[PDB]
Structures are given as structure tokens and as C-alpha cells.
Design a protein around this ligand. Structure first.
Ligand SMILES: [Zn+2]
Ligand SMILES: [Zn+2]
Lengths: 37, 35, 145, 337, 105, 123, 240, 102, 124
RNA sequence: GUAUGUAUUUAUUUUUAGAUACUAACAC
RNA sequence: ACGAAUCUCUUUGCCUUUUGGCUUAGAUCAAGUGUAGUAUCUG
């Protein structure tokens, strides 16, 4: 009933259906790349 | 020092050279702006 | 906002919800990464078979070695394969260095007196008294030798 | 099967020169977990740390240029970009941070790992990132919009090391389930699995030319052809375990960093081990703290840079005298497997 | 002798506030089961037959494991083509349940 | 019958190819081969990203972005047409957060192919 | 206890909810899976048991006791073909694990079918496993006849384990069965292969010593002191 | 002296069952195919109902014996050692593991 | 992408005698009547002027597995109820081929995702 | 001046004194 | 005479119901007090 013994596989989260809530940190920013020469 | 002693340069770095603002990759300005 | 309120109102809240590390839950995560990192090594040194029993056991030995490092007690196990002792000594030296460096940093943050939490003052005091007594015992032993 | 053993006695492989210790750089407070090198000018390092920082060292003189803070916990991996002036660092704090080399400030944060992220590799031609960690999945990030475009479900445990390649399999991955998968990203599923390792595959490296990969484990460093996914070769290794890292020079030299502190150099073609060194721990360190956490070669490949657990970076140079007078290493005796 | 008896009492018990509570609560639950069972047996002795209840649903998607195979993972295909042994199995299974309706284990 | 039994695993997977002849050359992947994989992969990822940015709740985020049915024998043809949603009503009437357990469909087996006594007294 | 059907039915529901609770929380801890499948067997319902096992394998396929109990669950209920398909899945997953191959061998021999065990051992030899497998295989043929065969077997074996004591086993077979004609020829077959490839150095010197003494000494048992001293004499020449 | 690797052990058990089986054969002496469809590749193998029942009975029997012997070691195990103080069974068992660690 | 790409499955019967038909495509419609997961929906009308409107009920997957028609839910070939065709097939052979279905929720929600193709379907 | 949890089926599916006591949002 | 099997016991091997996290040891430390409901001990 204590500690981790494992971690949660992202695989699970891969099969769920998306909610579509809009977060503050995914608002568009630095919208243009920079290429080197 | 003695652990190596001969060829090996043991250098202990703290502080900095190159004050933090420096670009560290130089922006390429193709045109020369006089403005 | 109201976009989130209502889309959450029809569509339910997200099931994933990963949650970032912050000021409060940091130390827990540090613990966690550490115990994992020791599991890897001490599983890959061993020749073949045993896992879970020796897992829980070896990680307990980790915790005990840490406590004994705070208390300045030397922590010998009467018997234990040497290489494992190499490993645990390594990681506990690491955690020790991080811990000490956090003590210095928080102290010199309090000397300036800028937004230190009510508890961080208490905790930091604790870490400093531990460190100070270690310096004392060091001085005394070195006087004996 | 002896026929194979005769066919191992014809070749007499590939002479090289030994290595030695040019320079020792102290200056990190914690361990040094990862190292990457400026892929264009060879003017510097970026070295992760266990103290959360990243310290940009000059390759020429070894002086310290600047410090990049910004992570709250240890930095497992760092990767610098070719086409871009960007530096992607990634840590145990569940976050992949971009860095704009021009202004030296965090630009973007990629979000969405469940837990600590131990590997970043920057796809050569696509403007992607590949990140992975204890999630047990590989996340292909769109560099511009910070959208985790593709997710690769697969390994049954944590993912240690990830690489990117321009043609098929575009992502190679290695996990503690002791496998190495060769991924096809467009379809988003395993193209090939390589199971030959007996324990966690803790390190890989891509040969800069031959289009193959070198995989590691406790005692056995194998190689693998990409494309078909064949085995290519093996490398002679008695217990060196544990192998923390691998690096491949342009001359077909294959480095192997030990946890016992031994530096095991190989020829890549053969499998022969032509040199083994032992590092000096440090003035006040512990015999446990002698190990090699990461390593790389410069763009030339005539220098080697190894972060060690003793809180020091060491720079290993290739001897110029050498030749046949007395180079010869262990000299090619293929024992029975 | 009193404080020694008490010491002997405390040193022998490691149950804990939560753990002791879950033991006794489990005893309560099993008692409730026994009660409902013997109810059903008594009403059966009078001929009136009443089915047992499913303990509602904690959450919306909760599963009743009896009603269906939880996650059915086919063993595999295979070359040896059993196809007969399944028949003998089903015969033995329907035999088992057909027994329990009468001799009652 | 020997074919059937362990039919999957076979010897030549254990044996390395370069041990026969060193210098057997594994070619790097040309040039105009990568200019292909880069093309198709790039297009595909663009389809995913643009597919996402037009999903979510921002009239803002959409600025960073066919009959097609021969049904059965094509007898009846078809023309496929999107319907403009009432902007107020939820678009995607059926998108609702729910959790799912996926099966793992194993078509074939990947043979796991590898090559103490006093030791325990040490370990 | 249980009385009527609906009584039992609940006794299933409850137990299952406890189990799949603890397995919902711990994907690992195979003991629990094994006990749970075991339960659904004691309910005389196989399909469920098989599902439980298959899941337990999807979690971990490298833990064999799981495999073995999942085999015996099919055998004890007298379902054989399942326990066959299951085997070709098992060994094909883990060809190095010996316990699997031996188990499938035994399960075949208790059914007296010797062709299946023959082809089986053939395949299990092709992968060049190790001395225990081969030795068990010739000890198979001895229970059979295949005196013509067991020679071929040893042929393969000595090519796949070029060591003395493999050859020493070879001749020890013939001398145990006493046939002299082949014995001599094979003792010849060892030594000329030695000196033929000896430049390749794999055979140790002491090995050569033990091999010489066997052939020369045995010829001395055949009273061919001319031949014996002849051999030994050549051995002096070919060696320091 | 010593431990045994999981291979040698596997071999030994295989031999043991071979001996047991050979004894069933001798005592039985004292008391006295492959078809694959063209339609599907499904293979079918003719079987004797005897020896299959004998197999199941062998497995069940050996399981019973093992379970019983281990059970007796259960019984003696707890009744032997009454020396040190113990709160519960599990404590006593743990401390006997500490006796094994010596 | 994944949901759109498989095209719909519609009978020729219920789709009517009209030569060319206009059908609407909604990228997230109701969930299946079966699996209870979202999918893409299709209106249409048999006639241009027919008042009645046809709405595909089940998934593409949940259909393909059973090999039926999304509007009808009749067998794709024989135009038969599912509970029948498996009875006819079951008449040949002896006892089998019943389609066992998914109580609870994530029993079914699970089940639709495997590629099995179903007991009834395989013959057809 | 206790979160919190469990249960709330009505409409009938075919065959003699007190000592040691435990506790009490009840009185510094 | 030894080969083979069953039952019983002892020794070795295997461990079987055989200690599952972090923080400032996580922090703190008694006669404690009046009355009252209810259990029960003795003539
Ligand atoms: Zn559906
Ligand atoms: Zn229709």
C-alpha cells in the first residue's frame, strides 16, 4: 500500500477519447521557426 | 595534479567568461542595416 | 475560461491529467527517480534470478543507509556483496550533495529575506543544525587521529 | 560450425591507435549526466548535470562560457540541432524545454509526459523531436506547434535511449524490457523488433556512415544493421557491466563507458577490443564514484568527451605516435562463445 | 503486574487504527452476507424464491464480472486443431453446474 | 513435420553477418531516397497537425493551419456534403471523455532469443 | 455452504470482484493471477481460466511458472491439443529456456508417440543449445533402437561441440556396445581431424594427450603394439 | 556445494519423470499418426484414451504429494522454534528467515 | 483520420432506387447503438423529396465485425437479421457460431476494438 | 459547532454499599 | 544377490503467510481534572 513498484504506461492514455479543454500554455506563441545557415 | 601530473591540464572552472547576454550562436545578418 | 467551463460541463473532465512538478511535490519526485535509478543498477549487477523480494530488501537498505548518513553513523551491514555497497554509497553521496546544496541555497535566500515560506525556515534550520553537528564531530575525530 | 571459426581467423582486423587523457575539467556541483556537442563549429559543449544546470564549455581551451539554469531537477539529456539554432534539453521534471541559442532563453515547453523524460533526439530532416522516458512511450513532438503529433506504444518498460534516422526506421528505441524496436512512424507501429539482448539495453549509438546502430546491455555490446534489421556483428566483451554509454567515431571506433570505470574501446568492423583503460577517480572521491555517465566525439572524431560521476568532464585524445611499433592491443583471439 | 500485563498487551498488537478497522468492518460485511443468505434459505423453505441483489454500482461504468467474460483473450490459433477437446470440456462443465442444482456441493 | 513445430525461430537469426567477411558494406541510404521519406512523412504530420488545430474551440487557432464514394458496385454513386453547425451548439455532439481498455492483438510471437551455484554466496 | 444455483452465482461474483480488484491495482504479482485462474478452474469453467492465463502472459511472458501451470491446467482437464498449441507457442517464444522443451518432451513420451519427440529433439538440436540437450537426446535414442541413427546424431553433435569429451563419449558408446570395427575407424576419425585443424588451436594440449592415450591404449587392448607404438610415435613428431 | 542452475535442475526433473514412467511401463508388463486437412492446415493426431488419463492422474498425484510434504514442513516449522519472543506467526517465520541468513 | 478513412457500409436495398444521392457527413455523431463510442454519421434521404431520413446507427468497425449494413443492420449479402443467419449457419455443422455479445460497458467498448471479425461473419 | 461511507423495493414476468472501570463538541 | 515401486523419518538444496515510500527522528509528550450514563465484585 506504498511505494511505486511500477509506473503508469502512457499506452493507456493513448487509447482514451480526447476532452478538448483549451489550456493557457498551448496558446500560440513563438509561431515561427528559425533556420540556421 | 599528481593523479595525472604530466600532460593533463586539471582546470577548475567557476564564474564565467562570456557574459550571459552573448548570443552563443551568432545571428546571421545577411544585409547590412545602416538604419 | 467559460469555454473550458462549458466544454467540461458537456464533455466531462479529462481523464489523463498529467501533473507537473512544483514547489510542493518536488522532494517526492526526487525520491522517486532515485529509488528507480537504484533498482536498475542493482538489478543489472546480479547474475540471474531473484527480483521482488530482493528489490524491496535492497531499497530498504538504501533508506537505512540514508538515515544513517544523516545521523553521521557509519552504516556497515555485517555482510553484503561489495559491489552493491559501492552503488548505494554512490547514490547516497549524490543525494547528500543535493541536499546540502539546497540547504546553502535556501539559507542565503533567507539572509536576504525574500519570500521564504513559514516552514522552509524551520526545515532549513533543521538541515543546518544537522550539518553543523557533522562539522563538529569531524573536527573532534580529526583531533583524535 | 567450425567453418565460421576458420572464417574468423582470416581477417586480422583493422589497426587503430590508442587513446589517452588530455584534459580534466572540474566545475559541476553534481554528476554529469549528458553531453552534446555543437554540430557545426565544434566550438563547445553543452553538458547536463545532476545539479539541474547546464554549463557550456569551450572545446578548445576548456573554459566555461555560460550557464543555463531553468530545470528544477536533474537533466538527463541534451541535444543540439543542426538546421536550427535550438537546443532541446530534457529532465526528470517531466518536461522538454527548447532553448534559443541566439538569446539564451527558454522558448518553448512541450507538455504531456506522465513522468521523467530521459531521452531527446532531433529528427534530421523533419523539424520533429523525439522524446521518451519512464512513460514507456515515445512522443514525436512537432517542433513548431508543440503538439505531440504521434505516440508510439510498444515497449513494456521504461525507454532509455532513442535515435532518429532519415529513411526507414525513423526511430530506434531501447528499453528496460531488453529489446530494441525499429519503428515505422507514419503507420505508427513496430517495423521490427530485436530481442537478442538479455537485460536492459541502456545505450545505443548510430554509426555516422554505415547506417547501423550499436546497442548495449550489461555484458554484451552488439551491433545491428538497420534497413533489414539484421544482426551484423557482436563485440567481444567479458564482464564489463554495466555499459552506460556508446559513441562511434568517424574512423569506425566504438567507445564503451563502464560503470566499473573502464573505458573499453573497440573497432567497429571487427568486434575486437583494442584498448581498455581505467580512469583515476579523483582527489577526495569514492571508489564507487568512478564511472562514466555519458560521452561523445567531436565532429572530427579525434577527441572524446566523457562526463563522469565524480563531477568532472574528461577529454580523451588519440595518441599520435602509435603505428605498429607498440600500439598492438589485445590482438585478436576469438575465444569460443 | 498491571503495567506489565499492559506492556504485554501493547507489544503483541501491531494492527493499527485503520487495519483493525478494516478487519472488523470485513467481519460486519460477511455477517451481512450470512444474514441475507439464511433469509433466502428460510423463504425458500416456504416456497417463495427471492434472488440476491447486486451491490448497486459505485460509478457509472462499473463492471459486473459474473455477467460476462471480462476481457476475453483468445489463447491463440495453433496448428494442432483441438476442436474436439472443447466438446468434452463443455460436457464436463454443464455436468458440473447440472450437479450443483441438485446435490449442491 | 519438423517444419511445423518451432516454425518461427531459426538458426540464422542468432548468427552475425559481418563475422563471415569484415568490410561487408552496409550502404548509407543514398540521397534521393531520403528526399522521399522526408516528403511523405512531412505531409502526413501536416495532416495530423492541421487535423488538430481545426478541432479545438479557438476561432484563433485555425489561422495557423469530393463524392469520393463509389458505394457497393457504384450503382447509386453518392455525393458527400458537410453540414454547417449552429455555432452556439456543441460541435462534435458525441465527443465525450470516456476511458477505454484496448485489447492487445497478438498475431505472431516474437521469439525472445538469447545465447548461480557458488555465486549466491557472493550475491 | 452453497445450496442452489443462485447461491453459487453470488459466490462467484464476490470472489471475482475481489480478485480483479487486486489485479486492477497490481498488474504484477503473478501469484495472484495464478491463484485466480486456479479459482476459475475450480469452478469447472475453462474458458474463463484460459482468458485469465492469457492476460497473465500479456503482462509477463518471461515468467515460466505461469507457463507451466497454464499447461497443467489443460492437461489435468484432459485437453491435449490445447496443451500442444500452447507448447509450440511457448518454446517458440523462449527457445533458450530448457524447462519448456523438456516438459513438452515428457508430455509427448507419456503419450508414447516417438516420432513427434524425434522431430522435436531434431529442431531443439538445430539451435545448438548445449550439452545437456544433446546428451538427453542420445539417451533418448538408446531407449529406442536407431543405432544407425544415434551415429548420425553424434555426428551432428561433435560438429556442434568440438571438444574431446564429446568424441570420448562417441567412442565410449561403441566400446560400451563393444563393436570394434567402427570403433577403430572413429578413433581414427578424431585424431586426423585434430591434426588437420590443429593449427586453428582450439583443442587444448592436454586434450590431445587424453585422446592419444585412449586410441593407443585401446589398440594395446586389441594387441596391436606395432600399431599403438606407431601412433604414439607419429604423435611425437607432430608435436613438442 | 551447492546451488543448482535452473537448467541442470530441469534436466534432473526430466530424468526423474523418465524413471517413474519406465516403472509404470514395467509394472504394466508385470500385470499382463498425423493427418492434416487440405481445407485447413489443422493437424490431427490419433490418441489412446489410456495414458492420457494416466498422465492427468500422474500430474494430480504429484501435485498432491508436493502440497502435502510442504504442508508437513509447515506444521513442524512453527512447532519447532519457541525460543525468542514473538507477537504473531509471521514474526516467528521472519525470525527463522533470520536464522537462515546466519 | 482513423475514424474517417474507412468508408461507410450501406446496403443497396435501403439506399433506394435513385441514381445519384446526396448524403451528409458529420465527423462526430452519436455513439454506436452497440460499442458506445463515437464515430462519423451519415444522413441521407432515399428520395430527394421523401420526408423520412436515414441515419447510420452503428460504427464501421462494429459493422464490419458483424458484416452487416449500417442503416439496416441486416446481413450485408443475404439481407437477414443477424440472429437468423447464425442460426442457418448453425444448422449446418451442429452447435456453434452464436454471436456472444458484450454486457456491461467497457466489455463492449473494449470488444469493438479487436480485429476478430466475429463468429457469424466468417462464413459470409 | 466531524468530514466521509453503507442501506433505504412501492407497483406480484407464464413451470446492601460502593471499587476498579470504559467512554463525554460537557466544565479550566 | 542387485535392479524397480509404494509408505515413513532425518540431512542438504529451494523459501513457501518470511518487515512495500518521502519530508524539520514528520512535530509534540501527562499525575491531568468534576460530574454523569452503562458494565460487575462482595457480604
Ligand atoms: Zn461501434
Ligand atoms: Zn441498409
Amino acid at each position: 500500500h506504498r511505494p511505486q513498484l511500477e509506473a503508469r504506461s502512457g499506452a493507456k492514455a493513448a487509447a482514451y477519447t480526447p476532452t478538448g479543454i483549451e489550456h493557457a500554455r498551448l496558446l500560440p506563441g513563438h509561431t515561427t521557426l528559425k533556420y540556421r545557415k | 595534479e599528481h593523479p595525472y601530473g604530466k600532460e593533463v591540464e586539471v582546470l577548475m572552472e567557476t564564474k564565467n567568461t562570456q557574459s550571459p547576454q552573448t548570443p552563443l550562436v551568432e545571428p546571421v545578418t545577411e544585409r547590412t542595416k545602416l538604419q | 475560461y467559460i469555454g473550458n467551463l462549458i466544454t467540461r460541463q458537456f464533455e466531462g473532465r479529462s481523464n489523463e491529467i498529467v501533473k507537473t512538478t512544483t514547489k510542493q511535490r518536488l522532494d517526492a519526485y526526487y525520491d522517486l527517480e532515485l529509488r528507480n535509478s537504484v533498482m536498475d543498477d542493482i538489478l543489472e549487477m546480479m547474475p540471474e534470478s531473484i527480483r521482488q523480494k530482493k528489490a524491496r530488501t535492497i531499497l530498504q537498505h538504501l533508506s537505512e543507509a540514508w538515515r544513517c548518513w544523516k545521523a553521521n553513523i557509519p552504516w556497515d551491514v555485517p555482510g553484503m556483496p561489495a559491489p552493491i555497497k559501492k552503488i548505494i554509497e554512490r547514490y547516497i553521496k549524490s543525494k547528500a550533495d543535493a541536499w546540502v546544496s539546497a540547504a546553502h541555497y535556501n539559507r542565503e535566500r533567507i539572509k536576504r529575506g525574500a519570500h521564504v515560506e513559514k516552514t522552509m525556515v524551520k526545515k532549513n534550520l533543521g538541515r543546518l543544525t544537522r550539518l553543523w553537528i557533522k562539522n563538529e564531530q569531524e573536527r573532534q575525530r580529526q583531533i583524535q587521529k | 560450425i567450425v567453418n565460421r571459426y576458420e572464417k574468423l581467423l582470416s581477417q586480422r582486423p583493422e589497426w587503430h591507435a590508442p587513446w589517452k587523457l588530455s584534459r580534466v575539467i572540474n566545475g559541476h556541483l553534481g554528476w554529469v549526466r549528458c553531453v552534446a556537442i555543437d554540430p557545426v563549429d565544434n566550438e563547445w559543449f553543452i553538458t547536463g548535470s545532476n545539479d539541474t544546470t547546464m554549463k557550456v564549455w569551450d572545446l578548445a581551451t576548456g573554459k566555461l562560457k555560460t550557464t543555463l539554469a531553468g530545470h528544477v531537477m536533474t537533466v538527463r539529456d541534451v541535444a543540439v540541432s543542426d538546421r536550427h539554432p535550438y537546443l532541446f534539453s530534457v529532465s526528470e521534471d517531466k518536461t522538454v524545454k527548447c532553448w534559443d541559442l541566439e538569446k539564451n532563453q527558454i522558448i518553448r515547453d512541450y507538455y504531456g509526459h506522465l513522468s521523467g523524460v530521459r531521452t531527446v533526439s532531433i529528427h534530421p530532416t523533419l523539424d520533429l523531436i523525439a522524446t521518451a522516458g519512464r512513460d514507456s512511450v515515445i512522443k514525436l513532438w512537432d517542433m513548431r506547434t508543440r503538439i505531440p503529433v504521434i505516440t508510439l506504444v510498444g515497449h513494456k518498460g521504461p525507454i532509455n535511449q532513442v535515435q532518429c534516422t532519415p529513411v526507414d526506421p525513423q526511430v530506434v528505441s531501447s528499453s528496460t524490457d531488453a529489446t530494441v524496436r525499429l519503428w515505422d512512424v507514419v503507420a505508427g507501429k513496430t517495423m521490427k523488433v530485436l530481442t537478442h539482448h538479455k537485460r536492459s539495453v541502456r545505450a545505443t549509438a548510430l554509426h555516422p556512415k554505415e547506417f547501423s546502430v550499436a546497442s548495449a546491455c550489461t555484458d554484451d555490446i552488439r551491433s545491428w544493421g538497420l534497413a533489414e534489421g539484421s544482426l551484423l556483428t557482436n563485440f567481444e566483451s567479458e564482464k564489463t557491466g554495466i555499459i552506460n554509454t556508446l559513441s562511434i567515431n568517424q574512423d569506425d571506433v566504438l567507445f564503451a563507458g563502464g560503470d566499473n570505470g573502464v573505458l573499453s574501446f573497440y573497432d567497429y568492423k571487427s568486434g575486437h577490443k583494442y584498448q581498455s583503460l581505467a580512469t583515476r577517480e579523483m582527489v577526495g572521491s569514492l571508489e564507487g564514484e568512478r564511472s562514466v555517465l555519458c560521452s561523445t566525439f567531436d565532429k572530427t572524431g579525434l577527441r572524446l568527451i566523457t562526463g563522469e560521476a565524480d563531477k568532472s568532464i574528461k577529454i580523451w585524445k588519440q595518441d599520435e605516435t602509435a603505428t605498429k611499433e607498440s600500439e598492438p592491443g589485445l590482438a585478436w583471439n576469438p575465444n569460443l562463445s | 503486574k498491571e503495567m506489565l500485563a499492559e506492556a504485554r498487551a501493547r507489544l503483541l498488537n501491531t494492527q493499527g487504527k485503520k487495519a483493525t478497522r478494516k478487519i472488523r468492518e470485513r467481519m460486519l460485511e460477511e455477517s451481512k452476507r450470512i444474514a441475507e443468505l439464511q433469509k433466502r434459505r428460510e423463504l425458500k423453505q416456504a416456497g417463495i424464491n427471492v434472488a440476491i441483489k447486486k451491490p448497486k454500482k459505485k460509478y457509472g461504468t462499473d463492471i459486473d464480472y459474473n455477467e460476462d467474460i471480462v476481457y476475453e483473450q483468445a489463447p491463440m490459433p495453433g496448428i494442432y486443431d483441438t476442436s474436439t477437446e472443447d466438446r468434452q470440456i463443455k460436457k464436463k462443465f454443464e455436468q458440473f453446474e447440472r450437479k450443483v442444482n441438485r446435490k449442491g456441493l | 513435420l519438423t517444419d511445423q513445430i518451432a516454425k518461427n525461430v531459426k538458426l540464422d537469426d542468432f548468427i552475425p553477418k559481418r563475422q563471415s567477411n569484415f568490410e561487408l558494406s552496409v550502404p548509407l541510404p543514398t540521397k534521393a531516397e531520403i528526399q522521399e521519406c522526408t516528403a511523405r512523412t512531412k505531409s502526413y504530420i501536416q495532416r495530423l497537425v492541421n487535423a488538430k488545430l481545426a478541432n479545438s474551440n479557438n476561432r484563433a487557432s485555425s489561422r495557423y493551419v469530393a463524392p469520393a464514394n463509389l458505394l457497393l458496385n457504384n450503382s447509386h454513386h453518392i455525393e458527400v456534403v458537410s453540414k454547417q453547425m449552429d455555432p452556439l451548439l456543441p460541435r462534435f455532439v458525441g465527443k465525450k471523455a470516456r476511458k477505454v481498455v484496448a485489447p492487445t492483438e497478438n498475431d505472431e510471437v516474437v521469439p525472445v532469443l538469447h545465447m548461480g551455484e557458488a555465486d549466491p554466496n557472493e550475491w | 455452504d452453497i445450496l442452489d444455483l443462485e447461491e453459487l452465482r453470488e459466490y462467484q461474483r464476490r470472489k471475482r470482484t475481489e480478485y480483479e480488484g487486486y489485479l486492477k491495482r497490481n498488474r504484477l504479482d503473478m501469484g495472484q493471477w495464478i491463484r485466480y485462474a486456479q479459482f476459475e478452474i475450480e469452478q469447472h469453467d475453462m474458458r474463463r481460466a484460459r482468458s485469465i492465463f492469457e492476460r497473465a502472459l500479456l503482462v509477463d511472458s518471461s515468467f515460466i511458472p505461469l507457463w507451466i501451470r497454464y499447461i497443467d491446467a489443460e492437461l489435468k482437464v484432459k485437453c491435449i491439443n490445447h496443451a500442444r498449441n500452447l507448447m509450440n507457442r511457448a518454446i517458440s517464444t523462449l527457445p533458450r529456456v530448457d524447462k519448456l522443451w523438456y516438459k513438452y518432451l515428457i508430455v509427448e513420451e507419456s503419450l508414447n508417440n516417438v516420432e513427434i519427440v524425434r522431430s522435436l529433439y531434431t529442431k531443439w538440436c538445430s539451435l545448438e543449445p548445449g550439452v545437456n540437450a544433446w546428451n538427453s537426446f542420445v539417451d533418448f535414442e538408446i531407449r529406442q533402437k536407431n543405432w544407425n541413427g544415434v551415429r548420425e546424431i553424434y555426428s551432428k553433435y561433435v560438429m556442434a561441440h568440438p571438444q574431446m569429451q564429446t568424441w570420448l563419449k562417441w567412442v565410449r558408446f561403441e566400446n560400451r556396445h563393444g563393436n570394434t570395427e567402427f570403433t577403430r575407424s572413429v578413433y581414427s576419425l578424431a585424431i586426423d581431424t585434430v591434426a588437420n585443424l590443429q593449427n586453428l588451436q582450439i583443442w587444448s594440449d592436454m586434450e590431445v594427450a587424453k585422446l592419444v592415450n585412449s586410441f593407443a591404449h585401446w589398440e594395446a587392448a586389441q594387441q596391436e603394439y606395432e600399431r599403438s607404438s606407431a601412433l604414439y610415435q607419429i604423435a611425437i613428431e607432430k608435436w613438442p | 556445494r551447492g546451488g543448482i542452475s535452473y537448467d541442470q535442475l530441469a534436466k534432473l526433473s526430466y530424468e526423474k519423470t523418465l524413471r517413474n514412467l519406465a516403472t509404470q511401463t514395467q509394472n504394466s508388463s508385470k500385470q499382463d499418426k498425423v493427418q492434416k486437412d487440405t481445407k485447413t492446415g489443422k493437424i490431427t493426431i490419433a490418441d489412446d484414451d489410456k495414458l492420457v488419463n494416466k498422465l492427468a492422474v500422474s500430474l494430480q498425484s504429484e501435485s498432491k504429494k508436493r502440497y502435502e510434504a510442504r504442508k508437513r514442513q509447515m506444521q513442524n516449522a512453527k512447532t519447532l522454534y519457541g525460543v525468542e519472543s514473538f507477537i504473531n506467526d509471521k514474526n516467528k517465520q521472519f525470525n527463522e528467515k533470520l536464522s537462515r541468513e546466519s | 483520420d482513423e475514424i474517417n478513412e474507412p468508408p461507410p457500409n450501406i446496403c443497396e436495398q435501403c439506399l433506394g432506387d435513385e441514381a445519384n444521392i446526396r448524403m451528409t457527413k458529420i465527423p462526430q455523431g452519436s455513439e454506436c447503438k452497440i460499442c458506445t463510442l463515437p464515430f462519423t454519421l451519415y444522413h441521407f434521404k432515399t428520395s430527394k423529396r421523401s420526408n423520412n431520413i436515414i441515419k447510420t446507427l452503428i460504427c464501421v468497425r462494429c459493422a464490419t465485425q458483424r458484416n452487416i449494413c449500417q442503416c439496416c443492420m441486416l446481413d450485408s449479402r443475404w439481407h437477414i437479421p443477424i440472429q437468423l443467419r447464425d442460426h442457418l449457419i448453425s444448422l449446418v455443422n451442429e452447435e456453434n457460431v452464436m454471436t456472444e455479445e458484450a454486457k456491461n460497458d467497457m466489455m463492449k467498448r473494449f470488444l469493438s476494438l479487436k480485429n476478430v471479425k466475429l463468429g457469424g461473419a466468417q462464413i459470409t
